[PDB]
Amino acid sequence: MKTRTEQRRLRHKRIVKKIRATNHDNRVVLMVIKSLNHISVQAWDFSQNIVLASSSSLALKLKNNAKLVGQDIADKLVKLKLTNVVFDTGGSKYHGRIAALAEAARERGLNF
Amino acid sequence: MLQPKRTKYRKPHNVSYEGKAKGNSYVAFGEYGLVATKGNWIDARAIESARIAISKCLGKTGKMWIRIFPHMSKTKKPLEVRMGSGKGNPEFWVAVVKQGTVMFEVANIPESQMIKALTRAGHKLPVTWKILKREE
Amino acid sequence: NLKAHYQKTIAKELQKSFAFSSIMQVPRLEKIVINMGVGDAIRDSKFLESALNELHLISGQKPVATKAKNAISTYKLRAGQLIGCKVTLRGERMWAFLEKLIYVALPRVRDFRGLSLKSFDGRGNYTIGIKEQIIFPEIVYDDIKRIRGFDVTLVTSTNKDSEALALLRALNLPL
């Protein structure tokens, strides 16, 4: 019935609804999007609905064990001195590639 | 006798007819219709008398459409009883008729015969009747 | 495997039969389900275990039993009391358990002459009913005190039923 992508968008809507209702501090949310070919990340600063930084395989990288999209975004955010975020798995599951991204993000000066 | 087969709530609020005929303003099925110039309550018995008058004088050629219907019930406390201590049982059903509702209407029979049929009808109803014709 | 014959010939065959020029506009057979409807478990005749075991025997899929989603007082089945059983088998199992019917089972039926003239849904599905499970080879004579049949379906990835005709004809089914 569903198209495996509208369904993922729906799970993401669920997650963003919980976040937008619960986030009492102004913590910047860290959205990760998982595609069959590779992966991308962007850090939506809510309460203004603009984007602060981003990363992807298309930073001259290969096809996503590519946790490198974690070290660079960690660097970009810590240059903005926020370092207190909340993670967002899109519609994915906190496992496999997403986990390898999140752990790399944590171990370079983030707090989430 | 016209009567709803079964109603939800047996004892409702009385509906004041002091208005200008929400709905049924104009004749809609026949060439001539009977209009009211003073709103009132006409029960099922009066609708029956009017219907049988129109049918008796109509002959076996034409058609009569009744527009109103005794949707609303009505109560009547039994006699020689003090007031209070409940609400009396429902007795008779009545169709609310606002001022200017085309309630009866006839078709397919000469002009003068229809006018006479309507006059023979409106003398059973309490409402001060009037004759209207279909527009075009 | 029957899948071998399909991926060897059928794609080209049905690609040329209908002017498509898209290698996978050809219909693809997607899943097969098996249901029996073990309703003789009013409360507990054998509590469905015989059905589960035999359906496990016929197919490599582990059987699963469905719970009633309704309440019926006409029988002793209301708001629970799982009845029946269900297999949804695919992969190599889908292609193989299919031919294992058509090449083993249907010649062993009481009378296998013809069907499928009117059994299509009209949206690309098909069904087969069997009146007794004793006919199939993956079973011994011993069974439940009653012998029941099967309900199997063929659902493909096309909605126009004539395409299902074409696919099942290309796969040599008894029409």
């Binding site: - | 039994p78 020689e80 009883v81 003090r82 201590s85 409940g86 609400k87 | -």
Partner: protein, 86 residues
């Protein structure tokens, strides 16, 4: 003489809890005040407002209070609190 009646069977009712709106627009409120009392969410909690398990709309920070329209046919009502120029 007298007459026979009785058994009304409909002389009962309940206390009317005073559910409704307590802070209209424009009001300066402090955290903890209840804005709206209701049975079921006739008003949704927006931003800087919380919902107490009595489905009670109550504030969480200082600021002006605003009602708003949203929903599939612009028929649902949100309530929210805006911080001052801090």
């Amino acid at each position: 003489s007298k007459k026979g009646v009785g058994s009304t069977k409909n002389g009962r009712d309940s206390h009317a809890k005073r559910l409704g709106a307590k802070k209209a627009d424009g009001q300066m409120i402090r955290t903890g005040q209840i804005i709206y009392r209701q049975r079921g969410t006739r008003v949704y909690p927006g931003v800087n407002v919380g919902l107490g398990s009595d489905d009670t709309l109550f504030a969480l920070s200082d600021g002006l209070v605003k009602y708003q329209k949203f929903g599939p046919k612009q028929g649902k009502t949100r309530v929210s609190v805006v911080k001052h120029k801090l």
